[PDB]
RNA sequence: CAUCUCAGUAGGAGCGGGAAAAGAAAUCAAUUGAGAUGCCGUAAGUAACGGCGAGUGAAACCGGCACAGUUCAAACCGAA
RNA sequence: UUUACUGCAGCCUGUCGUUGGGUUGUGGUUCUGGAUGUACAGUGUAGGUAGGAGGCAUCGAAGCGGGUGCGCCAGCAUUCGUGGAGCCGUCCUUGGGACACUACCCUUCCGGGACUACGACCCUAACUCUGAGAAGAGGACCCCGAUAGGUGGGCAGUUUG
């Protein structure tokens, strides 16, 4: 399915309907300095590592389309609950 | 400055591989390797180290060089059921340090004496060498000596085996006070060995 | 059930006395204070850890018992 | 039992320590002899950006040999010499930079002298094996300690609703 790249909607921050550009959200790299990373490094030793030797699970048949809406006026972005589609495109 | 020659011995042994001790080390480990486990010596190798650790030139004070192997606790793989955590032993070093191992071997070799202290005197890729000072509580010189006659007491016997030397206290975790010594003083066994 | 728990338990080896160990801060505090160690009460199932699950789990302050301080290495002398 | 899950031994391999001395090959470490700098033409080589101008000279300033720095067999430094006036520019050779012998750290210059990480070879002197020893054979390798990855039902604990 297609969603427009830019459309007029409500900005929660400036509290008005302005034009907003839609951007697909890319998952970031997990920090190596997080508390879970430090706990993993601390619990690594000889033997089973507990939950840190878990293999990542499976996948749902379709993933949600992670979208982020940036107000064109205040340049702040908000992200809303998103739909779930096999094929996603931007209308231009 | 007016420094004692003990100060020069200290400076020479501060960075031994950058001083003449490195060459001396080269000739000297050749002789030490041919020797056995526990060798009595006439004089300490590092006189200033011995004197600061308590060595005196008097009757009843013996100095020995002990040879100890390198690496951790050479441990046997269990042959019965274990947890995965308790199955691996190769990476498990001990809780007994090499210096205290040398002290205890010297104490075993010399049943009538008591270990006072010991210091590092060399090492190679396979061995470390320590010099252990021992005291004779039943020698009249030591009995007269009021800075050593505490060793004639019933509680001063078995010091190295009961962990009462400086290396033993360091291994017991009583080298410091305050935070981190909650489970170490007054003894490891007093808190179910949860410290260390 | 694997980390965890059971648990530094059971068991082992060494040493050892009527007690043993610890013991006179390179400490604990917090705006400025206290003043060796040990043991008891409390802090407190708190902080902390933990498939943050099950569980595990302090210390300081403070109130008590009892109170105790010192000896070397070196500087100076040089067998005194 | 295994190409079930998770581990642990053994083994293979990198790195560090053990572990030293020489020869060269590789990077810059560090600096002497030149500031070597030049679309257009130049009396003249931006003599680094410069007090936007101002010091030397027969007790030294050039048209030359394979031109000692360099390069367009020009020209600056006067050196092996012999020839007998290079100025600075307010006539700036209508300026990629326009130029006073004024403490050159800077794209070069190849004494690169000195330490360095990798690789190749040699030495013995550590270290190893043999021998009672003289000594013989290896040799900074191997073994060994640590660490990193692999392989690993040899072994352990479980699961298999």
From TrEMBL, chain A:
Its cofactor is Zn(2+). Keywords: Metal-binding, Ribonucleoprotein, Ribosomal protein, RNA-binding, rRNA-binding, Zinc, Zinc-finger. A zinc finger (C4-type) spans 11-74. GO terms for molecular function: large ribosomal subunit rRNA binding; structural constituent of ribosome; zinc ion binding. Zn(2+) binds at residues 11, 14, 71, 74. SUPFAM superfamilies: Zn-binding ribosomal proteins (SSF57829). One of its GO terms (biological process) is translation. The keyword tRNA-binding does not apply. Residues 28-59 are annotated as: Disordered. Part of the 50S ribosomal subunit. Belongs to the eukaryotic ribosomal protein eL42 family. This is Large ribosomal subunit protein eL42. It comes from Methanosarcina acetivorans. The gene is rpl44e.
């Amino acid at each position: 399915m297609k969603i427009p790249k830019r459309f007029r909607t409500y900005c929660p921050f400036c509290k008005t309907h302005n034009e907003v550009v839609v951007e697909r959200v890319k998952k970031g790299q997990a920090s190596s300095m997080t508390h879970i990373a430090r706990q993993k490094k601390r619990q690594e030793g000889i033997g089973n590592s507990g939950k840190f030797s878990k293999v990542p699970g499976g996948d749902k048949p379709t993933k949600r389309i992670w979208l982020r809406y940036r107000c064109t006026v205040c340049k702040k972005a908000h992200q809303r609950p998103c739909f779930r589609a096999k094929k996603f495109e931007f209308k231009e | 400055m007016v420094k004692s020659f003990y100060g020069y011995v200290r400076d020479a042994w501060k960075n031994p591989d950058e001083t003449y001790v490195n060459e001396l080390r080269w000739e000297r480990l050749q002789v030490w390797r041919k020797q056995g486990s526990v060798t009595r010596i006439e004089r300490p190798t590092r006189i200033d180290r011995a004197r600061s650790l308590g060595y005196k030139a008097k009757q009843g004070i013996v100095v020995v060089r002990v040879n100890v192997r390198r690496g951790g606790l050479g441990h046997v793989r269990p042959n019965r059921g274990r947890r995965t955590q308790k199955m691996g032993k190769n990476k498990v070093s001990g809780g007994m340090s090499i210096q205290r191992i040398a002290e205890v071997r010297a104490d075993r070799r010399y049943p009538n004496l008591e270990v006072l202290n010991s210091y590092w005197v060399g090492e190679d890729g396979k061995h470390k060498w320590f010099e252990v000072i021992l005291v004779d509580p039943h020698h009249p010189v030591i009995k007269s000596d009021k800075n050593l006659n505490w060793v004639c007491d019933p509680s001063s016997r078995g010091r190295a085996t009961r962990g009462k030397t400086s290396a033993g206290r360091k291994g017991r975790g009583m080298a410091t006070r305050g935070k981190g010594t909650e489970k170490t003083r007054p003894s490891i066994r007093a808190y179910k060995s949860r410290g260390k």
